[PDB]
Design an enzyme around this catalytic site. Structure first.
Site, PDB file in Angstrom:
ATOM      1  N   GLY A 172       1.314  60.599  84.757  1.00  0.00           N
ATOM      2  CA  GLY A 172       0.587  59.589  83.990  1.00  0.00           C
ATOM      3  C   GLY A 172       1.258  58.228  83.986  1.00  0.00           C
ATOM      4  O   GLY A 172       2.306  58.033  84.606  1.00  0.00           O
ATOM      5  N   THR A 173       0.650  57.288  83.268  1.00  0.00           N
ATOM      6  CA  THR A 173       1.156  55.919  83.183  1.00  0.00           C
ATOM      7  C   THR A 173       2.351  55.881  82.239  1.00  0.00           C
ATOM      8  O   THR A 173       2.528  56.781  81.425  1.00  0.00           O
ATOM      9  CB  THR A 173       0.088  54.933  82.664  1.00  0.00           C
ATOM     10  OG1 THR A 173      -0.104  55.116  81.254  1.00  0.00           O
ATOM     11  CG2 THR A 173      -1.245  55.115  83.390  1.00  0.00           C
ATOM     12  N   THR A 174       3.163  54.834  82.339  1.00  0.00           N
ATOM     13  CA  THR A 174       4.359  54.733  81.506  1.00  0.00           C
ATOM     14  C   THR A 174       3.993  54.297  80.089  1.00  0.00           C
ATOM     15  O   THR A 174       3.109  53.462  79.895  1.00  0.00           O
ATOM     16  CB  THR A 174       5.394  53.752  82.093  1.00  0.00           C
ATOM     17  OG1 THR A 174       5.505  53.954  83.508  1.00  0.00           O
ATOM     18  CG2 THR A 174       6.763  53.961  81.444  1.00  0.00           C
TER      19      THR A 174
END
Ligand code: MG
Lengths: 226, 244, 195, 241, 250, 231, 204, 196, 243
Positions: free
Chosen positions: I29-31
């Site tokens: 996933g995204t940070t």
């Protein structure tokens, strides 16, 4: 019914009369109103006799199982708590009015419990129709630091007040003593101040007095061989 | 999820047999032999205990023969524990019928309900069937003396003489040979023992490896008595028929 | 429904049941049959609250007809009457109990005996030589107590019934529009079509 | 072999899921130790904070179950907290129903029974934890009762749990063979804590600072955990002896 | 969630074996030896307290358990399975007997109840069988003294004497030689102690041996007086000291 | 492969194959486009027939007077999800006398689809949805995927060959976003976008479905002769 | 309208020397109307005897119920139930209906087959046990029965003396109750014979 | 019942009579109506003894479990748990409870919960049948931030009057002091308070 | 083997592979990050701009619980929402019974026990998110991070997603070079920087920055989003630090 509980030096004593009534009629002249919950926790019951017996045995059963589960001797506060939560749930419809007493690892204890599940603590208590006669005696003769002999005497004196003055109570006095570090001693018919006097006449009948139409041997045995 | 671990106890094979029923029957074929024989004046139930130890308490023991009511008993071949579940059900059904109609339950009606219970375990619920075959020996006033068997499939049939458990093929042949219709109870007792004598996998047939029962008119007038034989009585009947 | 009578003679059971059906102010019907055949040799008459009477009678009838098919066999009158008692005793502690009283008259083909069973809505069962429900017994029991014999013929039973019905017609305030009489014996159930 | 995945018997009569749950027990690589004094029960556990980003104060495997009972857990934190919450709920319910404080050994039995069920019922997995319960029981005195994923439990004179439990166990066994008594014959809990830390150092052969440990103490009517600085006070006294 | 294992985990294999029951019996075989002997005026049940660590306090672990005042039980196999069966066995003695009849169940019927529970774990959905065999010893007025074995299948049998677990085959042979119908209770205790020494490796004393009897009524263990017909429990666990007194007399 | 038997299983790379397989049903579905200005929002959908004797499957469903969607994939699943929306819009009206915000409708749809991706025995939804509506904060277009992911956009397209229309809209962005006050121009632009996804076929009178909602326009569907204007 | 006095009837039981006696009238009515003169109120399960007064449907129902339970008891226990045990089963069974009870006054009588002790007990509708040495009374003429028994009874009567006493107590109590009478039966119970005698009495 | 709780400079004091009554009969003349639900959160009970005991027992259970999970509860939190029980079960309860506790941030606090299960935070509160007779007195004599002795006197004098006029009240005057210094139980017998 | 095909199954190592597989979706996933400051917490997240067609500012990812708690997560977004919904029920029921708003440590365990519950059965799948959350309670500021296993701890700073190692490194620097504290406004800026720096690992697409905060002084202990002027200021700060 008259029931009492009195604390003393090294324990607690409970007593009760032995009359159970159906309205104005005496159903049983020698009733047992002292109930064992565990070996050293006994409680006296007034109110509906079936309710006092039933609720005493249910909690007694569950206490035994609890004792086995915990590997500990049962405490009075457990019997109290289990009794009150059961009675409260039934909002007074289970007509059990109990004086709960005993000894356990914690010490000696005396409680009473109303049918609606309200409880109290004291050194001396009474319940039932004769509770006012009894309490008058307790409030007249109770003191701090009673010996075992003094408490038995006070307890049975209070039951006698009920026996003599309350029409709801009569016949005999039962007592149970729970002393710390000793076996409980249940004293069935501790007093017998009401033996019926000898009758004026014998009413034994001449045999053949009663008219009979038929006789037959009733077969109580199971189905027979051969 | 959980589907992975499901055996599916209630399915057909491609041949159209019920796997678990067949395998339960296979289990039952290794059980102590039980025989029932029906006569004009009574019924015999004989069954072999599974190979005992000398330290087993025999007189206070029951493994094979159970009382269902006063007029009906069963002989068990299979898992004892499975059988007791069913026996208590049967005992309860007998009492419901008596409470409802104020008459003792006709033998077949009791047999059908037990068989119907077994059947259910083969069609729904995903549970293993009961590893039990019964021989029902009973009397009622419609059909008189009756013998039935039921097995894990829930199928039941009626018999003049029948065996369940081990060596039924051998035992059924021996019964077919010596059984006659006008036979009496005392003859039937003998046939039952004689058959177990020849079919047993043990060295010899002793009292301590047996359970035995009769249902007889043998009471005082139009009524019926159940006799579960005490160890001594089996020992005596063994001597009396000259098998020891 | 009002009057229902039963009498057990030598070899049969006779049931008599009033024909009127009243909805408060008017008599809606004068030919109502307050009876159901439970099996070829068992008849049940009934009286009690409107609707519940027939609902109960038909429910029992269905159960006994079901039993007959399953076992290919006719239940004894004693057995049927016990089933019926249990159903009423079941019902008395229900949310809404059946208010139905019944007489069960059957001929037991096994014992070759006629049998009459009286069961009220509480499930109170009693075997009797003669019986009734409601107020019917109050007028008729003194006649039956006088004239009844265990060895009466079917026609002697009908004559005693004729007398019972006449007393009812004389002293009862309600017009119950006569009775239908039915006989239960070894050959089954038939109706006396003139009374 | 699906007898490996759920709690049913293997042909040798084993429960592999139970055994593999015992292996998860050591996943944290922490060792713990419990001992009894005259008046108290002490439990110490290694404390390891690898990440500099963590808030060290929130990292613990010691739980205050009730006023009187403490619990240290050997195993992953999620199963530990699951067990802690349950034990807290069970201890409070017991108090309400029976009118006295739940004893250490009884709570241990109760949690042991709950674990047993997961060994028998297929849909529930065992928890990968070993639970060491400590208290000063009002009837039994200082108490240690330990639970595992098999549903087994027993009382202990002292005990240890973790990867290097065997070293600690024998170290403690050797002490009690010498002293010939059931407990640490010491007056103050401060000294019993010092004994516990000392014998952990000897058996593990490692030196501890104030943040490498985590200490729990049970006395009559309260169980409490020590702060970094209470432990520091303890380490200093050990060094000067 | 929900238990979605509503199907049997014990099923018949093509040979007709019930695999999980056999495997449970195997877990019992690995278990520590335990035994029971019936005398004319008593029963004795006994086993080894195989302590896991010497830091464990093994008197806190009860292998021999009171079920009713006149019934006791011991096991071989998985201890945790035993502990819960004892909890259930005690409760079922009350719920399905004492709360109905106002008295404790007779030995055979309480056994019947324990057996039922064990049978159900052999057929119900989503459970395995219990990995224990029980020996249950007890007394009741109309049957006298009795000794029962209960297996994972739910089957139970009455015994004069038997042993289960590790060294059962040897122990049963030992017992066959010494058992007779005229043993007084002290004789059976003595035999139990002799039989048990065979299967025990290390220390053999009152602290590593757990042993109880069903014998005479103990009014001193009742806890109260004044009801003539309550005479006290017949179940009694022997003390560490009591056992050692009989080991010198050995 | 071994990890695609049900929705309750992760692959070793952390993927949910049953969800990805559900996403595939959308790609075989017929193309549909959504786009909006500041005053209106338009759905265009290419309807697919079974053959020349059959009707053309309806692709647009009205949810409230101010909200509706177009579908791509399993149609019965769109019916189930659109019905759920009709209820949620309704509950918001009956209880709060409030028209349900398009943003909330998206959150509720996300949460409904999500539950079918975490439990045994269930299956993910096999349909994608383009939701347009006009509410208290103006015009809105949403893209629902059965993974649970809901996304607010100026325009988009889903179904077979939807990639063509998606880039057209990516180019046209600054043009069509400006089309305020002209409904017919916004539709014209939507029809042009869906035309980037045609091949072999083109827009007919019973091929094409257009829907529109906006400032003073109830959500209304145009089919049949009523779309000839735009062919 | 009061369920315990719709049908009427009485039961009395007494102890003597190595024997007990239990007796009942035979009336069943619907209030003023006498309905049956053959409604026996004493039943037995093996050697344990149970008399039941009160609402007749419940009397019948409870007999059917205790027959059911004592039959299953016998099959499982492999012995006939004793009076002490049966008494507890009766009590248990009644209290289980605490808030919707059977409207009955049961009476238990029998000799314990092991100890030889004679035993009687009485219950209220809700299960309370009255275990008396001397006698137990129940039904619509229970006041009258208490009166008769209290003067007529003496302990350790021989079977055929006890018969006269219990018969006279029943008969004269029934004759002062509108809802009792119409016949009477007395059971005399010894360890291995039970004699049942029907009494001749007025039929009004 | 005559019960009250009063906040002062160092915390809070609870006070009560000791009479329990079944009609005219005094069932208990030495009742303890001051009940503990946490170390320094107590309550005064009035109404049905069965109801108020059952409620207090449940509240004590909730706050014990609260403590195990989240540390020491606020007096406000305790009052809210009482209220939830009293409000949701208003149709089956007769309970008038005063909740009083000592925080270190919040100091002494008093919450009264009348029959309907509403909550009212007050500087002091009075309740029970006996309270009606001392509304005048208490309103005229209460000031904020009294000393421990002044507050003890206020409660003693107030409950003395309530007992004097209310036949339902009587016996001893019990008090419980709640401060940072711990928990102090007090008792005052008839011969002391009657002559006041 | 076969141990990894069913949730709640222990492998012979003692691991639950399905939980470990869930972690892979988190790492994918995204940070997203959290920074604990002097009197509060700051949350930030990378939103990948998949297309020009994403309406900017309008796909909000950070979520509020009650009025004082912020939650952000990386991984399967719907799983995160499902968890926040449960968190909101837990907070409502706590407030309802106890009056006071739920303390942050108490709130963490509520999520903890719920997530751990989804590792006990094969009939459910573990949560495909790591969730960073926290806020201000009566005892001050708290920042928490919670994994798919149900494991959670308190943090000085925390990060998760594809750029988690880059961010972790950057967080450790702040902790070392500000050992006496970091102000709320400082933390907002640093959060912008760290997300920009961690965006290297996701560089194909450019992104939208999103920040929130609860601070006793700056937001009154309530959770608020960083919009407009304060957002733009921190965007600038970060843009200057990559050059
Ligand atoms: Mg008359």
């Amino acid at each position: 019914t008259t029931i009492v509980g009195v604390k003393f030096n090294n324990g607690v004593v409970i007593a009760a009369d032995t009359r159970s009534t159906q309205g104005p009629i005496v159903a049983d002249k020698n009733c047992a109103k002292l109930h064992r919950i565990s070996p050293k926790i006994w409680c006296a019951g007034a109110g509906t006799a079936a309710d006092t017996e039933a609720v005493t045995q249910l909690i007694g059963s569950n206490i035994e199982l609890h004792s086995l589960y915990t590997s500990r001797e049962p405490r009075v506060v457990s019997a109290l708590q289990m009794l009150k939560q059961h009675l409260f749930k039934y909002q007074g419809h289970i007509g059990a009015y109990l004086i709960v007493a005993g000894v356990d690892p914690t010490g000696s204890h005396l409680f009473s419990i109303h049918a609606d599940g309200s409880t109290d603590v004291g050194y001396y208590l009474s319940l039932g129709s004769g509770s006012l006669a009894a309490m008058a005696v307790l409030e007249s003769h109770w003191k701090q630091d009673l010996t075992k002999e003094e408490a038995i005497k006070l307890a049975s004196d209070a039951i006698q007040a009920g026996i003599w003055n309350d029409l709801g109570s009569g016949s005999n006095v039962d007592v149970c003593v729970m002393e710390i570090g000793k076996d409980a001693e249940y004293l069935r018919n501790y007093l017998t101040p009401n033996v019926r006097e000898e009758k004026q006449k014998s009413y034994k009948f001449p045999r053949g007095t009663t008219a009979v139409l038929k006789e037959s041997i009733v077969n109580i045995c199971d189905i027979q061989e051969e | 999820g959980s589907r992975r671990y499901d055996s599916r106890t209630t399915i057909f094979s491609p041949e159209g047999r019920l796997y678990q029923v067949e395998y339960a029957l296979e289990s039952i074929s290794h059980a102590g032999t039980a025989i029932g024989i029906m006569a004009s004046d009574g019924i015999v139930l004989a069954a072999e205990r599974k190979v005992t130890s000398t330290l087993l308490e025999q007189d206070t023991s029951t493994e094979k023969l159970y009382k269902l009511n006063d007029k009906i008993a069963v002989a068990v071949a299979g898992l004892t524990a499975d059988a007791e579940i069913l026996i208590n059900t049967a005992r309860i059904h007998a009492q419901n019928y008596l409470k409802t109609y104020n008459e003792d339950i006709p033998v077949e009606i009791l047999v059908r309900r037990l068989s119907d219970i077994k059947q259910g375990y083969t069609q729904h619920g995903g549970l293993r069937p009961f590893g039990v075959s019964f021989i029902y020996a009973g009397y009622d006033d419609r059909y008189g003396y009756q013998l039935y068997t039921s097995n894990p499939s829930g199928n039941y049939t009626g018999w003049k003489a029948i065996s369940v458990g081990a060596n039924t093929s051998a035992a059924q042949t021996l019964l077919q040979m010596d059984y006659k219709d006008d036979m009496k109870v005392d003859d039937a007792i003998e046939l039952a023992l004689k058959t177990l004598s020849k079919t047993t996998d043990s060295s010899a047939l002793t009292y301590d490896r047996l359970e035995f029962a009769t249902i007889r008119k043998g009471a005082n007038d139009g009524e019926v008595y159940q006799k579960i034989f005490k160890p001594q009585e089996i020992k005596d009947i063994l001597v009396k028929t000259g098998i020891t | 429904m009002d009057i229902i009578l039963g009498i057990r003679v030598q070899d049969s059971v006779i049931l008599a049941s009033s024909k009127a059906v009243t909805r408060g102010i008017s008599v809606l019907k004068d030919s109502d049959d307050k009876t159901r055949q439970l099996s070829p040799h068992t008849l049940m008459s009934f009286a009690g609250e409107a609707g519940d009477t027939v609902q109960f009678a038909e429910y029992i009838q269905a159960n006994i007809q079901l039993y007959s098919i399953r076992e290919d066999y006719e239940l004894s009158p004693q057995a049927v009457s016990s089933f019926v008692r249990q159903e009423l005793a079941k019902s008395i502690r229900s949310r809404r109990p059946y208010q139905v009283n019944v007489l069960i008259g059957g001929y037991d083909k096994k014992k070759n005996k006629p049998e009459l069973y009286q069961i009220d809505y509480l499930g109170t069962k009693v075997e009797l030589p003669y019986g009734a429900h409601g107020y019917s017994g109050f007028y008729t029991f003194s006649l039956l107590d006088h004239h009844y014999r265990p060895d009466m013929t079917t026609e002697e039973g009908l004559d005693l019934l004729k007398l019972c019905v006449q007393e009812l017609e004389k002293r009862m305030p309600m017009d119950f529009k006569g009775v239908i009489v039915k006989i239960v014996d070894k050959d089954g159930i038939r109706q006396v079509d003139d009374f | 072999g699906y007898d490996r995945h759920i709690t049913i018997f293997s042909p040798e009569g084993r429960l592999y899921q139970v055994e593999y749950a015992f292996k998860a027990t050591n996943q944290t690589n922490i060792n713990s130790l419990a001992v009894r004094g005259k008046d108290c029960t002490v439990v110490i556990s290694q404390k390891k904070v690898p990440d500099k980003l963590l808030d060290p104060t929130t990292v613990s495997y010691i739980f205050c179950i009730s006023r009187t009972i403490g619990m240290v857990v050997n195993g992953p934190i999620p199963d530990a907290r699951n067990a802690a919450l349950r034990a807290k709920a069970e201890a409070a319910e017991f108090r309400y129903k029976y009118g006295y404080d739940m004893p250490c050994d009884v709570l241990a039995k109760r949690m042991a029974n709950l674990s047993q069920i997961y060994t028998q019922r297929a849909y529930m997995r065992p928890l990968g934890v070993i639970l060491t319960f400590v208290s000063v029981d009002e009837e039994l005195g200082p108490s240690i009762y330990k639970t595992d994923p098999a549903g087994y439990y027993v009382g202990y004179k002292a005990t240890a749990t973790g990867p290097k439990q065997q070293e600690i166990t024998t170290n403690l066994e050797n002490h009690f063979k010498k002293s010939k008594i059931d407990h640490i014959n010491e007056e103050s809990w401060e000294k019993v804590v010092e004994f516990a830390i000392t014998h952990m150092i000897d058996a593990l052969g490692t030196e501890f600072s104030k943040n490498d440990l985590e200490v729990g103490v049970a006395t009559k009517d309260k169980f409490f955990t020590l702060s970094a600085e209470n432990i520091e006070e303890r380490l200093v006294a050990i060094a000067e002896q | 969630m929900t238990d979605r294992y509503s199907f049997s985990l014990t099923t018949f294999s093509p040979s007709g074996k019930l695999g999980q029951i056999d495997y449970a019996l195997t877990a019992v075989k690995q278990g520590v030896t335990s035994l029971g002997i019936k005398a004319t005026n008593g029963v004795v049940i006994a086993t080894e307290k195989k302590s896991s660590s010497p830091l464990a306090m093994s008197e806190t672990l009860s292998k021999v358990s009171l079920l009713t005042p006149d019934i006791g039980a011991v096991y071989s196999g998985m201890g945790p399975d035993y502990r819960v069966l004892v909890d259930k066995s005690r409760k079922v003695a009350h719920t399905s007997y004492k709360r109905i009849y106002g008295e404790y169940p007779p030995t055979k019927l309480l056994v019947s109840e324990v057996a039922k529970i064990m049978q159900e774990a052999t057929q119900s959905g989503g459970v395995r069988p219990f990995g224990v065999s029980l020996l249950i010893a007890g007394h009741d007025e109309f049957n006298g003294f009795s000794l029962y074995q209960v297996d994972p299948s739910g089957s139970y049998f009455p015994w004069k004497a038997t042993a289960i677990g590790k060294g059962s085959v040897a122990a049963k042979t030992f017992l066959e030689k010494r058992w007779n119908d005229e043993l007084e209770l002290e004789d059976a205790i003595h035999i139990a102690l002799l039989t048990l020494k065979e299967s025990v490796e290390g220390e053999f004393n009152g602290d590593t041996i757990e042993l109880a009897i069903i014998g005479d009524e103990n009014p001193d263990l009742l806890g109260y007086t004044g009801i003539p017909t309550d005479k006290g429990p017949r179940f009694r666990k022997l003390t560490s000291q009591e056992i050692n007194d009989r080991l010198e007399a050995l | 492969n071994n990890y695609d038997g049900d929705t309750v299983t992760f692959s070793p790379t952390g993927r949910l194959f049953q969800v990805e397989y559900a996403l595939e049903a959308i790609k075989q579905g017929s193309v549909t486009v959504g786009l909006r200005s500041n005053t209106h929002a338009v759905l265009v959908a290419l309807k697919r027939n079974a053959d020349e004797l059959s009707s053309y499957q309806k692709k647009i469903i009205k949810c409230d007077e101010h909200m509706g969607l177009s579908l791509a994939g399993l149609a019965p699943d769109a019916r189930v999800l659109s019905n759920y929306l009709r209820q949620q819009c309704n509950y918001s009206s009956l209880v709060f006398n409030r028209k349900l915000a398009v943003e909330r409708a998206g959150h509720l749809l996300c949460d409904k689809a999500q539950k079918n991706t975490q439990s045994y025995g269930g299956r993910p939804y096999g349909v994608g949805l383009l939701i347009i509506g006009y509410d208290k904060s103006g015009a809105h277009l949403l893209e629902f995927q059965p993974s649970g992911n809901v996304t607010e956009l100026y325009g988009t397209a889903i179904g077979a060959r939807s990639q063509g229309a998606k880039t057209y809209l990516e180019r046209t962005l600054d043009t069509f976003i400006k089309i305020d006050g002209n409904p017919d121009e916004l539709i014209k632009a939507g029809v042009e976008a869906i035309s980037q996804s045609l091949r072999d076929e083109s827009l007919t009178v019973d091929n094409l479905s257009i829907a529109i909602v906006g400032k003073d326009t109830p959500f209304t569907i145009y089919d049949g002769e009523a779309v000839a204007k735009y062919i | 309208s009061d369920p315990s006095s719709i049908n009427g009837g009485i039961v009395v039981a007494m102890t003597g020397k190595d024997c007990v006696a239990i007796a009942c009238d035979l009336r069943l009515g619907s209030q003023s109307l006498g309905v049956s003169n053959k409604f026996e109120k004493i039943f037995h399960y093996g050697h344990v005897f149970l008399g039941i007064t009160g609402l007749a449907t419940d009397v019948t129902t409870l007999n059917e119920m205790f027959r059911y339970k004592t039959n299953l008891y016998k099959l499982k226990e492999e012995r006939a139930i004793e009076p002490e045990t049966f008494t507890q089963l009766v009590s248990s069974s009644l209290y289980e209906r605490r808030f919707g009870p059977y409207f009955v006054g049961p009476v238990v009588a029998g000799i314990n087959s092991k100890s030889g002790k004679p035993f009687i007990a009485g219950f209220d509708l809700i299960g309370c046990i009255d275990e008396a040495k001397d006698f137990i009374v129940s039904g619509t003429a229970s006041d009258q029965l208490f009166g008769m028994c209290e003067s007529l009874y003496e302990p350790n009567l021989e079977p055929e003396d006890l018969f006269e006493t219990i018969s006279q107590a029943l008969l004269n109590a029934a004759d002062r109750d509108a809802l009792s009478g119409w016949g009477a039966v007395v059971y005399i119970i010894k360890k291995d014979e039970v004699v049942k005698r029907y009494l001749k009495m007025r039929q009004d | 019942t005559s019960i009250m709780a009063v906040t002062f400079k160092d915390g809070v004091i609870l006070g009560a009579d000791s009479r329990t009554t079944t009609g005219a009969y005094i069932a208990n003349r030495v009742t303890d109506k001051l009940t503990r639900v946490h170390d320094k959160i107590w309550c005064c009970r009035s109404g049905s003894a069965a109801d108020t005991q059952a409620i207090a027992d449940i509240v004590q259970y909730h706050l014990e479990l609260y403590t195990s999970q989240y540390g020491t509860p606020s007096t406000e939190t305790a009052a809210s748990v009482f209220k939830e029980l009293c409000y949701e079960n208003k149709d089956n309860l007769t309970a008038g409870i005063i909740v009083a506790g000592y925080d270190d941030k919040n100091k002494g606090e008093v919450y009264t919960i009348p029959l309907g299960g509403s909550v009212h935070k007050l500087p002091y509160a009075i309740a029970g049948s006996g309270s009606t007779f001392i509304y005048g007195y208490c309103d005229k004599n209460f000031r904020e931030n009294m000393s421990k002795e002044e507050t003890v006197d206020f409660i003693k004098h107030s409950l003395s009057q309530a007992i004097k006029w209310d036949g339902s009240s009587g016996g001893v005057i019990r008090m419980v002091v709640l401060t940072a210094a711990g928990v102090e139980r007090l008792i005052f017998y008839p011969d002391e308070y009657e002559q006041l | 083997t076969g141990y990894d095909l069913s949730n709640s199954v222990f492998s012979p190592d003692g691991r639950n592979f399905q939980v470990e597989y869930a972690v892979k979706a988190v790492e994918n996933g995204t940070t997203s990050i959290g920074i604990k400051c002097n009197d509060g917490v700051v949350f930030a997240v990378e939103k990948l701009i998949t297309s020009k067609l994403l309406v900017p500012q309008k796909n909000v990812k950070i979520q509020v619980v009650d009025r004082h708690i912020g939650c952000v997560y990386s991984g399967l977004i719907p799983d995160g929402r499902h968890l926040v919904n449960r968190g909101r029920e837990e907070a409502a029921s706590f407030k309802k019974l106890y009056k006071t708003p739920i303390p942050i440590p108490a709130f963490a365990d509520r999520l903890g026990q719920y997530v751990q519950a989804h590792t006990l059965y094969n009939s459910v799948r573990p949560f495909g998110v790591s969730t960073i959350f926290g806020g201000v309670d009566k005892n001050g500021a708290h920042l928490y991070m919670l994994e798919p296993s149900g494991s959670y701890w308190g943090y000085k700073g925390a990060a998760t997603g594809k750029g988690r190692q880059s961010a972790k490194a950057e967080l450790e620097k702040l902790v070392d070079h500000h050992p006496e504290g970091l102000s709320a406004r400082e933390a907002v800026k640093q959060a912008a920087k760290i997300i920009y720096l961690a965006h290297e690992d996701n560089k194909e697409k450019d992104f939208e920055l999103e920040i929130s905060w609860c601070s006793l002084s700056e937001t009154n202990g309530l959770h608020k989003f960083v919009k407009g002027d304060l957002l733009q200021e921190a965007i600038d700060f970060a843009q200057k630090e990559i050059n």
